[PDB]
Amino acid sequence: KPTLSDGTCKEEFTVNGDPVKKVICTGPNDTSPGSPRHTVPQCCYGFCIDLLIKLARTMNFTYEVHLVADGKFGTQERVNNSNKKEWNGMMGELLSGQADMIVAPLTINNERAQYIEFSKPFKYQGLTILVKKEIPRSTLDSFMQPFQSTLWLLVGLSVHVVAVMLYLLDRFSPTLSSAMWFSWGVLLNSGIGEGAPRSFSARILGMVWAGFAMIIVASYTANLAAFLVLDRPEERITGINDPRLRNPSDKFIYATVKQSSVDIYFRRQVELSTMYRHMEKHNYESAAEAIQAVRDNKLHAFIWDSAVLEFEASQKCDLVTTGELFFRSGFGIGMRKDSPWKQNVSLSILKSHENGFMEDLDKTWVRYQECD
Amino acid sequence: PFQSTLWLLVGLSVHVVAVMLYLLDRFSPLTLSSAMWFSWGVLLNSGIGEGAPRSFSARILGMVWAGFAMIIVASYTANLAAFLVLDRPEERITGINDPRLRNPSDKFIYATVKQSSVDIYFRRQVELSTM
Amino acid sequence: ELFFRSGFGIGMRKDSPWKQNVSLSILKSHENGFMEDLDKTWVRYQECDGVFMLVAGGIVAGIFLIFIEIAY
Amino acid sequence: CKGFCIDILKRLAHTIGFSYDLYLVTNGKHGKKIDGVWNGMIGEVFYQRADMAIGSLTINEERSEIVDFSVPFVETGISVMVARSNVSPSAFLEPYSPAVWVMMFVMCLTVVAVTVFIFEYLTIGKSIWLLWALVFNNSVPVENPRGTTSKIMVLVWAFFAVIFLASYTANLAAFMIQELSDRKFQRPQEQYPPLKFGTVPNGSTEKNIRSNYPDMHSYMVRYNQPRVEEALTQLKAGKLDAFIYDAAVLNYMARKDEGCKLVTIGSGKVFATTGYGIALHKGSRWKRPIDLALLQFLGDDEIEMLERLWLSGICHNDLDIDNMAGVFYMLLVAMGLSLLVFAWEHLVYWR
Amino acid sequence: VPCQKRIGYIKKCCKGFCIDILKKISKSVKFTYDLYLVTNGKHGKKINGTWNGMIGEVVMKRAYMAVGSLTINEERSEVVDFSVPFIETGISVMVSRSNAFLEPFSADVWVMMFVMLLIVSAVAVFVFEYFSFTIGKAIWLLWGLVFNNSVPVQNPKGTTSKIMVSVWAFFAVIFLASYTANLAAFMIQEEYVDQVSGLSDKKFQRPNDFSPPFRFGTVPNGSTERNIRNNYAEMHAYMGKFNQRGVDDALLSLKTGKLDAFIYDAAVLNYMAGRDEGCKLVTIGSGKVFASTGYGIAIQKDSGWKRQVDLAILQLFGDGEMEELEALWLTGICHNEQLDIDNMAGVFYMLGAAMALSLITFISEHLFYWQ
Numbered sequence A: 001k002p003t004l005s006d007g008t009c010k011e012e013f014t015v016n017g018d019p020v021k022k023v024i025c026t027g028p029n030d031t032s033p034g035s036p037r038h039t040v041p042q043c044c045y046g047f048c049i050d051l052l053i054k055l056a057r058t059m060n061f062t063y064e065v066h067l068v069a070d071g072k073f074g075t076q077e078r079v080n081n082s083n084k085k086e087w088n089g090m091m092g093e094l095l096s097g098q099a100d101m102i103v104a105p106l107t108i109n110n111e112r113a114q115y116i117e118f119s120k121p122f123k124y125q126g127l128t129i130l131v132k133k134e135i136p137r138s139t140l141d142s143f144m145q146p147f148q149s150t151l152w153l154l155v156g157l158s159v160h161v162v163a164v165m166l167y168l169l170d171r172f173s174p175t176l177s178s179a180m181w182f183s184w185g186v187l188l189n190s191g192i193g194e195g196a197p198r199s200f201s202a203r204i205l206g207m208v209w210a211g212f213a214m215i216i217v218a219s220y221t222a223n224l225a226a227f228l229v230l231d232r233p234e235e236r237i238t239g240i241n242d243p244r245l246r247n248p249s250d251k252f253i254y255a256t257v258k259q260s261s262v263d264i265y266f267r268r269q270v271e272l273s274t275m276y277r278h279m280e281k282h283n284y285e286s287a288a289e290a291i292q293a294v295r296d297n298k299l300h301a302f303i304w305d306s307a308v309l310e311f312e313a314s315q316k317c318d319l320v321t322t323g324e325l326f327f328r329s330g331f332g333i334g335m336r337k338d339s340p341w342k343q344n345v346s347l348s349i350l351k352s353h354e355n356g357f358m359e360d361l362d363k364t365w366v367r368y369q370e371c372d
Numbered sequence B: 001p002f003q004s005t006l007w008l009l010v011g012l013s014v015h016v017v018a019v020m021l022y023l024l025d026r027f028s029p030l031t032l033s034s035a036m037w038f039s040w041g042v043l044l045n046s047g048i049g050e051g052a053p054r055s056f057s058a059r060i061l062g063m064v065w066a067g068f069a070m071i072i073v074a075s076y077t078a079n080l081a082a083f084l085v086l087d088r089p090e091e092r093i094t095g096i097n098d099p100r101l102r103n104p105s106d107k108f109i110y111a112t113v114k115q116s117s118v119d120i121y122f123r124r125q126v127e128l129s130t131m
Numbered sequence C: 001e002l003f004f005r006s007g008f009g010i011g012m013r014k015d016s017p018w019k020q021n022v023s024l025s026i027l028k029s030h031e032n033g034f035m036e037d038l039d040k041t042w043v044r045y046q047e048c049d050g051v052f053m054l055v056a057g058g059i060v061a062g063i064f065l066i067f068i069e070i071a072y
Numbered sequence D: 001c002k003g004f005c006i007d008i009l010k011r012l013a014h015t016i017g018f019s020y021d022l023y024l025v026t027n028g029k030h031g032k033k034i035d036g037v038w039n040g041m042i043g044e045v046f047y048q049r050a051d052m053a054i055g056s057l058t059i060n061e062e063r064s065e066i067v068d069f070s071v072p073f074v075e076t077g078i079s080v081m082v083a084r085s086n087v088s089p090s091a092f093l094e095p096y097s098p099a100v101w102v103m104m105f106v107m108c109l110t111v112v113a114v115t116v117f118i119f120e121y122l123t124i125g126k127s128i129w130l131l132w133a134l135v136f137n138n139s140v141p142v143e144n145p146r147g148t149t150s151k152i153m154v155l156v157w158a159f160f161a162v163i164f165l166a167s168y169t170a171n172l173a174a175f176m177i178q179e180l181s182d183r184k185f186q187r188p189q190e191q192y193p194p195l196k197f198g199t200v201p202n203g204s205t206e207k208n209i210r211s212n213y214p215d216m217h218s219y220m221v222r223y224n225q226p227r228v229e230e231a232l233t234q235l236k237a238g239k240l241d242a243f244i245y246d247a248a249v250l251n252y253m254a255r256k257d258e259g260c261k262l263v264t265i266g267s268g269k270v271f272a273t274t275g276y277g278i279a280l281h282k283g284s285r286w287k288r289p290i291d292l293a294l295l296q297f298l299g300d301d302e303i304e305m306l307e308r309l310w311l312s313g314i315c316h317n318d319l320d321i322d323n324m325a326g327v328f329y330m331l332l333v334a335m336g337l338s339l340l341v342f343a344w345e346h347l348v349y350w351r
Numbered sequence E: 001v002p003c004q005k006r007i008g009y010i011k012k013c014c015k016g017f018c019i020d021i022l023k024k025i026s027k028s029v030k031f032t033y034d035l036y037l038v039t040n041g042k043h044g045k046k047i048n049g050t051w052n053g054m055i056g057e058v059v060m061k062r063a064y065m066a067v068g069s070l071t072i073n074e075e076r077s078e079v080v081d082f083s084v085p086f087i088e089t090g091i092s093v094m095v096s097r098s099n100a101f102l103e104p105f106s107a108d109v110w111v112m113m114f115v116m117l118l119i120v121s122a123v124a125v126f127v128f129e130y131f132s133f134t135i136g137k138a139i140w141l142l143w144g145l146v147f148n149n150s151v152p153v154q155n156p157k158g159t160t161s162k163i164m165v166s167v168w169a170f171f172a173v174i175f176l177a178s179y180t181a182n183l184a185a186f187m188i189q190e191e192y193v194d195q196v197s198g199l200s201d202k203k204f205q206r207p208n209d210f211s212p213p214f215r216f217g218t219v220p221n222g223s224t225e226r227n228i229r230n231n232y233a234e235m236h237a238y239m240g241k242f243n244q245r246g247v248d249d250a251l252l253s254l255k256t257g258k259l260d261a262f263i264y265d266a267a268v269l270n271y272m273a274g275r276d277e278g279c280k281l282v283t284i285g286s287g288k289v290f291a292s293t294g295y296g297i298a299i300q301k302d303s304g305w306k307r308q309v310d311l312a313i314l315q316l317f318g319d320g321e322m323e324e325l326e327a328l329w330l331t332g333i334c335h336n337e338q339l340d341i342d343n344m345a346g347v348f349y350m351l352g353a354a355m356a357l358s359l360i361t362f363i364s365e366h367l368f369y370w371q
């Protein structure tokens, strides 16, 4: 968040009144790739910041948090302008010397493990899929909606034919308007009807009519029950292995975050470079705008860690995640090789899990249970 | 989907309310025979019975008295509806690459024809050696 | 769902001189409708081809109630 | 170049071991006889210009005479494709078939005589009138007995009726919880309209359909769609309604279209069922090393996995007017049933 | 793989998920193995300064490695080293499965027909007033029409007087049919009431003074019990009575009724839940881990293989090999997805309350003329 007019950047209280802990966070502002970058002091807070403060007090070291020059994670990025390759982003900064510790969501994989250590993960997670949620409207129906409206005039005509000849046979063999009260009343199941038939032909006809009475209302009860049961678009992308992903159809567009770990995962695989070869052109500079693009119906699917996507889906009730996790690897504090802080840092994380400390962080920074 | 003890409370409810309704009108400024004639039927929704509530206190009796059925008659329609939603996993019809096939503990004990080719197929498949 | 798709066949020794003849005859009777005729004739169709019971007691109970009502 | 057949070729070279160069054929399509000369994928293997012909080749009788095919690995026949038609019925709504119907009619018939008998102890017309009244929500003027025993027997009629009505909602609710005819086209223009159907007439599909049904082939010359997609678009536009081609391609095309609007005739109709294969040199002597290699991939998990990678498309197969107009058939017997009663009563006194 | 057992030696064979991982690593590290079962103790418990169990052999230079069911925690990291975890594990609780007229729909509906009570009453009197019963009797029929009952009541006459009530008649049947159809939907939308919310619930924290006490227990000599004995010491004292001897014997005691809770590992209870008859047992919270600590392979202190073994494990995740192992070995059968007294007792709560409303109206007659 941007700072205040003074050096400080405002204070506020949490749900229980505890003061949120913030640290000055210097870094570039107004990124806008293609424009000059200036360094303006800001302040950062959240999950990793709270954990970082705990380690500083325990092991008695001071710090000065600063952001990254380019908003990208690590990537090998082999180029022809150099001999073989050179690291870029956060990972390169750690090896250069400008950074001693890395505290941020950063997946543990093979490529980054050949040069840096990883301590132990805070939390375990995996990849998933984010898609646009279906129509919130339930398409709730009104009266005269179920069943054909035209044939309901036939039902209206059904009593018409019964009414006309009911008393027509009451004149020849043995008023016309005096018979429809019973005929109309019985289908109302009311007490208006009072004329008990006397002729055997009408007496039989009266009773066999009664069998026609209750079927529609019971059927209409079921038809109303049909309205509250049948609702299934069956639009659920099931896992990575769904055939829709394999074929690069143009009706849907797949995208991810540039230079992230998922980009490395797909490139390394010797088979998957058949769909994302077409989705490579459709990428993004960060995960903070792909959500907006999906919300604007310019995308169909997104691939990212379940730690972030699950939080976003809960907060805004316009997206629903689907699919299943298929690549599980927790985050972790990163540091250069032969660093002496590694043994102490790993023990504190393990000791924090048993103390229940991570439970407090989860319930004040992740879980909001909104619009469930 | 019924319980005798639960059927008892509804079954005995009519008897308790039938006697109470008749004796209530004595203090107003109902014979016992009528109380067992037009009260059993209405709760059962039957045309057997005669008479209508007469006293002002008797008039207010019918509100809850009538209100019994439609709030409970639909419940059975809901109560029966629960079971048709239940189909049981008896039609599990599980097959091909299922844990049921590779569950070697006295459940399915399925067999094939000796010699043949399916015996060769299982023998060749080293992943299903236990089966 | 099927998981081993492979047809049948007539078996014979390696040096059988009739192998080339037989394959052509099967492939010539497989398209002029002969296989359909055998399919329909033999394998195709071969068609396979408390409370309510207590109503007697209820009438007796009703008769017993009728007898009691008549007596009383 | 990549796909299904190429994947098999790459796998085959691993076990056997050789060097292969692809030689895409300039001449049109697979094969055809021009009275002495073979062309296409089979013309360049009979004339000793190649050693193998991999692709979507189909086994036949003329081809197998002059070349040696391998063991088939994909099924293929003859099929027709049509569009998608525009109810979920229940005749009388059939609660438990005409079994409970016999019970209620027989039960209600016997009680009327029984109830009439007990009235003499204390009515032919009153007993029958009230009995069918209460079981059908009354709503009719019916005599109410003043006795004690009579009122009890009538009373237990209602609670049986309503639970029957509640059960009469269950079966209708049951059906919705559980939750297509191609008799046409079976005629060579013998149908009332001018029927149109066409093929891509160069391959075995024409040759097989040219020998038998000669009259159909002569009429079919009016429709010679020289493509697969071009015939597809004309089919949707209503110009054509029947397309006859391979059953391993039409099925695939009808298994990836949007809206599930294209379903082949029947439920996977196949007529000849002559599988694919690999053409050889008739003297190549590579036939044996291929058969054992190919028969392995059909064994456990190899071939049964490739088809998931390539041919795995989606959009497969899956109250109206007659549902409520099922009891209408019983309305046609309403006035007729009552008409004969008057005639029967008229002859009672007259005769 | 051959699996030697000590104490004389009797040859046995070992297989499963852990063994499959072990042989895959040996094909990329270029080393062999001489597996042997641990005889004395199991899983380790530091007593009087000396260790035992599986971890008690790596410390005293007897195995140099240990692969199996090991939970990473701080007390073992100081003595022995651990590799990168390859599976998740926490701590959970296993329980059995359990055996309101306004609960369907909501209070929104019941504020509507109240208007119809006044509206229909005024309509009949207004029509009858013009042509010229009423409050005394006519209120009975129009409210009685709401309920399809055969009560013998008068039928008002009039060529047009009863025309509108016929129109008013079919409003009820479509209303009640709608009023009963939605009820079945709530049985489709039925939820699971559950009993507890986690280890921090009052029921777990209350040994006594909470009705018949909650019967929960576990098996000692493991990480799942030492963790409890360091934060909730007062709770661990009470649960000592309900101790078991193994997972299998304790599991069957749940069905009998002697126990109704089981605090154990969060990665082996899932297998029990997914491989039981009729899936009558479900974990609390649908797989809610509490103290997330994964598994791993324990290596001897200051071992050069540590840098190589963890790298190989991370290669398996990228190569997508772990999916086949878990699908083959760690897949269950069932998946988590009868009217009673308690549910319809609340229905009678208002009817019983509405019964008393008839008694108060009786005293109104006392002051009808006196006051």
Ligand SMILES: O=C(O)CC(F)(F)C(=O)N1N[C@@H](c2c(-c3ccc(Cl)cc3)c3ccccc3[nH]c2=O)C[C@H]1c1ccc(Cl)cc1
Pocket (backbone or CB within 6 Å): C031, C032, C033, C036, D078, D080, D185, D186, D187, D188, D197, D208, D209, D213, D216, D242, D244, D271, D272
């Ligand atoms: O002659 C007659 O009296 C007509 C009739 F009876 F022939 C008839 O209508 N039909 N016969 C069917 C049939 C054929 C076959 C396939 C295509 C055509 Cl064009 C002609 C025939 C077939 C072809 C090769 C090998 C086996 C076959 N087995 C079979 O059953 C198929 C069926 C048919 C279905 C759809 C269309 Cl659009 C047109 C005909």
Ligand SMILES: *[C@@H]1O[C@H](CO)[C@@H](O[C@@H]2O[C@H](CO)[C@@H](O)[C@H](O)[C@H]2NC(C)=O)[C@H](O)[C@H]1NC(C)=O
Pocket (backbone or CB within 6 Å): A340, A341, A343, A344
């Ligand atoms: C990791 O923690 C241990 C235990 O606190 C640290 O060891 C202490 O180090 C300080 C100064 O380095 C000494 O004054 C203490 O006597 C040490 N205590 C013990 C028990 O050895 C260790 O220094 C920490 N790691 C690092 C890199 O500082």
Ligand SMILES: *[C@@H]1O[C@H](CO)[C@@H](O)[C@H](O)[C@H]1NC(C)=O
Pocket (backbone or CB within 6 Å): C017, C018, C021
């Ligand atoms: C059939 O077999 C005979 C003898 O094996 C052979 O001479 C002949 O060419 C074959 N084919 C035909 C069509 O007769």
Ligand SMILES: *[C@@H]1O[C@H](CO)[C@@H](O)[C@H](O)[C@H]1NC(C)=O
Pocket (backbone or CB within 6 Å): D028, D032, D201, D202, D226, D227
């Ligand atoms: C069909 O084969 C003939 C054979 O010469 C060829 O001339 C013709 O172009 C082919 N049809 C199409 C559509 O290519």
Ligand SMILES: *[C@@H]1O[C@H](CO)[C@@H](O)[C@H](O)[C@H]1NC(C)=O
Pocket (backbone or CB within 6 Å): E045, E220, E221, E245
């Ligand atoms: C746990 O350890 C104690 C102490 O060694 C021992 O008495 C007890 O038997 C052990 N538990 C089991 C189940 O063996």
Ligand SMILES: N[C@@H](CCC(=O)O)C(=O)O
Pocket (backbone or CB within 6 Å): D030, D056, D057, D058, D202, D203, D204, D205, D206, D246
């Ligand atoms: N796949 C077949 C289709 C046409 C035909 O039946 O010949 C082929 O090209 O040979």
Ligand SMILES: N[C@@H](CCC(=O)O)C(=O)O
Pocket (backbone or CB within 6 Å): E043, E069, E070, E071, E219, E221, E222, E223, E224, E264, E265
């Ligand atoms: N692997 C864990 C599991 C504990 C248990 O199953 O009780 C340990 O030995 O500590």
